[PDB]
Design a protein around this nucleic acid. Structure first.
Lengths: 87, 61, 90, 59
RNA sequence: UGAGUAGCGAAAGACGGGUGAGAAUCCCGUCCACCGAUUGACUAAGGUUUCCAGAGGAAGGCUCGUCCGCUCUGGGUUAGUCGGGUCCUAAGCUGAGGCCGACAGGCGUAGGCGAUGGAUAACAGGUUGAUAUUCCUGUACCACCUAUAAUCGUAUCG
RNA sequence: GAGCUGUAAGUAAGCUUUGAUCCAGAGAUUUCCGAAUGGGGAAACCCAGCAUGAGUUAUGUCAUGUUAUCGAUAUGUGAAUACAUAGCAUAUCAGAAGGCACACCCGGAGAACUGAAACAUCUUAGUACCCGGAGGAAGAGAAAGAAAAUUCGAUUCCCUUAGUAGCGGCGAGCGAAACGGGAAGAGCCCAAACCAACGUUGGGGUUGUAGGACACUCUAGUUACAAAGGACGACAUUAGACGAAUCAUCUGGAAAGAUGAAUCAAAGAAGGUAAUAAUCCUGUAGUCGAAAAUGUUGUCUCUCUUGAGUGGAUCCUGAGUACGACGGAGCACGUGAAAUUCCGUCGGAAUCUGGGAGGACCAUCUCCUAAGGCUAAAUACUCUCUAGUGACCGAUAGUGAACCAGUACCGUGAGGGAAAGGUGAAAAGCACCCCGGAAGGGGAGUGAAAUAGAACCUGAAACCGUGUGCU
């Protein structure tokens, strides 16, 4: 389903997109077997591998008040056919 | 107080919220990420239609 | 009471006795903006209209053009605004 | 959990007095004896005081 | 007030070229000096973004500072084989029914939890500003499923 | 009934007179932890069984239900041990658990410092702390009573009796009740005799002027006790709507102030508006109003229902109970001449010509009838909601906390704990020029005022500087 949240557009991810790799933001409590089936169901491609990782919340401040950002789970998808999962 | 005009039958109530989430919520949300999306009030409008389609379907029980 | 578009007379302040026309309404802070009243010079120099308290303006009766109070009559299912010391529906 | 199964007798509390009228706390226990008495099922051992063993009680 | 007084926390720096409003103190170069069973290379505990890049000089740095473990913005952690769980138990803890106890509760049987120990399938090379038995290249191993098999049937499995 | 997208300003994109936002009633959704309940665990995490379904050539993955312990009830149900009985398996259960207002109430258990000018009996004190069980109140409650009148008639609370009677190393100290005056105010159900049925369940029966059984003529619903399920109109609360009466001049940046003319009042409470307003605004007095939900009451329906006197041959009226000895406790009362009532141990009655009490005890008189149960009101307290009040505080005060406070911070932990309010009526929050890298400043503008420029109302003293008359 809508496991995916947003795509990741950075300098390192741009170098990944030249070799059939795509970086997304997924839900914090899903495994990469669900992410594998979610990509093929939406974009109609054939996935070959998924690697996934976690980042901790970061300390942030504005004015005097201090808080934390959201924790996130990042998935990198390797395809064997198809591309252009965004513009 | 809002405007509800969903007179559809059950077989058509299910498909209303499959089309309204596949493109009217998921396609509008990747456009805001990479950046192509003007007129951003569409996102909030669609989310309330999904809420409307579920309140009415549940009263049918 | 004082709604946008009406002709009003100022009864207190610097531009007192000067008729105008309400252009903006601020029900939260109880202020109205009247045309040609309390201009300000903002260094951005710019001339714009400032706001005055809603209790500083009074509505004018059409039959005499003298400031009057506003009542309600309950004629039909809807309400109308009557002018005191007169009978005309504002 | 030590009480008479029939009468409901149990321990009390009071004072121990010396000849000079000094006082300390003490307890008055009950003469509970472990006996087998006929109940609806198997006769199980229960605590029964000796006062309840007079005038004829099942054993 | 003491008073512009005590102190500035073990030690070798010198010159040239830059940047800059401002240079004993920042960057580059040369020479010289110190450790080297360690002032070198890994890593457990613990800390929790202090890591990288582009900018900044109010406060912190016992001096200065154009610089930073300090301020702003944007980034970075990828595993069937590595450590741990889907395996095992020591000490200890907890305990169905059970025993004891004014109440609260204490002790304990079968059963569980619990590594500092036992069992357990992958290596070499390359690459980025920030990751590497995790990414890429080449060559392997272990468990399970599906389709046909030479050979099977008192076979097989426990 | 016209703007709105919370602090909060910002820009961007939008909704709304086909009734946005907003206020009230009723619904639907409601991640994870936590009694936490499938198992485990270092809370907010990990790992499963079983039955249905989604997807796949198949495995691997996903979704929706359900699976703790104890207790009470139907059911199958060998043990040892013939029969039976422990154990075992499944089913049903708005059955239990935890939290809570560190207030009020009942019970279990229970100190010390202190006073006695030392201290042991005594006092602090049945207080603090701990544990259990509740309720909106709880506890008590229908005479084996108080007393001594020509008698009253369940319980609780207030006034007085009264610092009296009394208790006390007769020291320090402790300290009542009845009478009388008030608030509030109903009383009832069972066991036994006895009759009918197959030990059982029905009926009969509840007391002191002596009642009941047996035998003699015999018919107000009280759902707060007294027996327990429901349909039946008026109010109250939860959104709101109408609601009288003023103009002119002067000073000022601004009028509500001063000076003249008026008006309203079942409305001269209060708050705001550029300074001090009954008539500018929100209000006030007085009226009006409910889709829907809840509460309290009343009118039929509905549901139970046996009433009093005469006879007393005979029978019944609560047992290891009352009471006694020993050891303690509680009664204002410290064992004292200690009645009255509670616990542990050991003994242990009577039956209406009976039993108890009237402060050891006996006799006579008077009053009552123990050893079963239930019961509203007057009473106590405030975590709270609604509407108000004060010769109470005004930022070192008032709650620790007027401000992002049980927070910064400190400690392994239990736990301890601050400081910090104010521009202006209106941001109109200083366009532009000059010195500088910037901070900072000098003009020019805003404003009544900038020595009101966000380190902002007023701005004291300590302390630090510059310039000057006399020495």
């Amino acid at each position: 389903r809508d496991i995916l949240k947003r795509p990741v557009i950075t300098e390192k991810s741009s170098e990944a997109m030249a070799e059939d790799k795509y970086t997304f933001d997924v839900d914090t409590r899903v495994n990469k077997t669900q992410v594998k089936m979610a990509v093929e169901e939406i974009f109609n491609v054939k996935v070959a591998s998924v690697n996934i990782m976690n980042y901790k919340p970061k300390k942030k401040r504005m004015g005097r008040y201090q808080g934390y950002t959201n924790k996130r789970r990042k998935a990198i998808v390797t395809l064997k056919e198809g591309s252009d999962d965004l513009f | 107080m809002k405007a509800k005009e969903i007179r559809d039958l059950t077989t058509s109530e299910i498909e209303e919220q499959i089309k309204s989430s596949k493109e009217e919520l998921f396609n509008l949300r990747f456009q805001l990420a990479t950046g192509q999306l003007e007129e951003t009030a569409r996102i909030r409008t669609v989310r309330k239609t999904i809420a409307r389609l579920k309140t009415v379907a549940r009263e049918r029980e | 009471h004082i709604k946008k578009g009406d002709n009003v007379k100022v009864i207190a302040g610097k531009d007192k006795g000067k008729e105008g026309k309400v252009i903006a309404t601020l029900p939260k802070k109880d202020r109205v903006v009247v045309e040609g009243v309390n201009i300000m010079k903002k260094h951005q120099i710019l001339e714009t209209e400032a706001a005055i308290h809603v209790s500083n303006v009074q509505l004018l009766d059409p039959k005499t053009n003298e400031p009057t109070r506003v009542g309600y009559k309950f004629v039909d299912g809807k309400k109308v605004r009557i002018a005191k010391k007169s009978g005309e529906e504002i | 959990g030590k009480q008479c199964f029939v009468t409901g007798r149990k321990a009390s509390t009071g004072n121990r007095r010396s000849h000079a009228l000094n006082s300390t706390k003490r307890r008055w226990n009950a003469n509970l004896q472990k006996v087998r008495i006929l109940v609806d099922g198997k006769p199980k051992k229960v605590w029964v005081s000796a006062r309840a063993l007079k005038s004829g009680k099942v054993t």
